[PDB]
Each structure stands twice: as C-alpha cells, then as structure tokens.
C-alpha cells in the first residue's frame with residue numbers, strides 16, 4: 001500500500017519552512033540590507049553582497065513554494081476524494097487520469113522548492129568568492145565580512161530545507177501515479193495506506209493551513225527587504 005497523504009517532513013507537526021528553520025538566514029538578510037554606507041574601500045563589495053542577498057530573496061518570491069503548496073492543498077481536498085472513489089470503483093482509466101493531474105501539480109510545487117534550493121546553493125558559491133576577496137582587500141573590521149560569513153554558515157542548511165520539501169512532494173507524485181496503476185489489477189482496499197478518501201483530504205487540508213500561514217508571513221517579510 002502507498003501513502004497518499006503528505007509525507008515527511010511536510011506531515012510534521014511544525015511546518016518545516018518558516019522562521020523556525022530559516023530565522024538565522026532571515027536575520028542575516030535584514031542585517032545585510034542595513035549595512036552602513038560610509039566606507040569607501042568596502043562600497044563595491046558591499047553592493048555586490050547586497051545584490052546577492054536580494055537576488056536570492058527575489059528568486060524565493062518568484063517561486064513562492066509555500067503559496068504554491070497551499071493552492072495545491074485546496075485542490076487536494078477534492079482531488080484525492082475523487083481519486084479514492086475511482087480506486088474503490090476499480091476504474092483504472094479514471095484513476096490514471098485523475099492521478100496524472102494530481103502528480104502534475106505536485107511536481108510543479110516540488111520544482112519551485114528545488115529552484116529555491118538551487119538559488120541558495122548558487123548564492124553560497126558567490127559568498128565563497130566574496131569571502132576570499134574581502135579577507136585580503138578589506139583588512140580591518142567591516143560588517144559586510146560578517147554578512148558574507150553569515151551567508152556561508154546559513155545557506156546550505158536553508159537549501160536543504162527546500163530540497164527536503166522537493167523530495168517529499170516528488171515522492172507524493174510518484175505514489176499517486178503508482179497507486180492509480182494498481183487499479184483494476186489488485187483488490188482496491190490494498191492500494192492506499194489510508195482507510196478513506198476523507199482521511200487523505202483532511203491531511204492535505206491540515207498541511208494547507210500551515211502552508212497558507214507561512215506564505216502570508218513570508219510575503220510580508222520579503223516586501224521589507
């Protein structure tokens with residue numbers, strides 16, 4: 001049997017994307033915006049550093065994975081019960097078509113998450129370059145050097161959060177297609193791990209509540225960078 005509800009970590013009690021997991025990187029981004037602008041030696045490096053932070057946040061906003069997930073969860077509330085009914089009716093052609101649709105939506109959300117991870121990992125390579133340039137070019141105390149160090153410390157764990165979201169959603173897409181492929185081939189009740197269409201819908205609805213909240217919190221935050 002295959003799990004059609006959200007998979008870890010999206011099934012976690014605490015939604016995995018938010019200040020709980022990204023707050024150190026958020027703070028670092030706020031500090032980078034507000035760096036002082038009196039130092040001549042640092043000015044160009046600091047502009048480049050600030051543009052790197054801003055590029056990554058802008059990329060994040062373009063993708064908006066939590067907002068996209070929340071939209072999916074709304075769809076899931078009706079799409080999974082409809083699929084479950086097709087499974088129970090041993091309706092292979094219907095189940096396949098419905099699962100294909102669900103999977104398409106899941107894989108688009110997963111790609112958005114993956115795109116955020118890619119932006120962060122690419123940002124880390126920029127920070128690596130900046131760290132070396134500034135260690136030599138900017139001998140004394142410069143808050144931008146700390147901002148680069150912050151990026152190096154926090155970007156890869158942050159990227160991993162998004163990679164794990166991507167992995168979960170891609171697995172959900174695989175599972176829903178695989179489930180529909182069994183319809184008409186084995187007994188219907190052996191296909192899904194869950195005991196009802198409603199149980200599956202409720203699990204996506206619960207995730208949707210969390211994703212919606214985060215989407216709105218993030219929207220606020222990015223508009224002040």
Ligand SMILES: CC(=O)/C(C)=C/C=C/C=C\C=C\C=C/C=C/C=C/C=C/C=C\C=C\C/C=C/C(=O)O
Nearest residue numbers: 048049052053056064065066123126127129130151
């Ligand atoms: C090359 C050269 O000459 C020099 C000088 C390079 C210097 C580079 C310096 C810094 C680089 C930072 C890069 C990336 C930052 C990224 C910051 C990201 C912050 C993200 C914060 C929160 C994210 C929340 C996501 C929510 C989305 C959702 O829930 O949908």
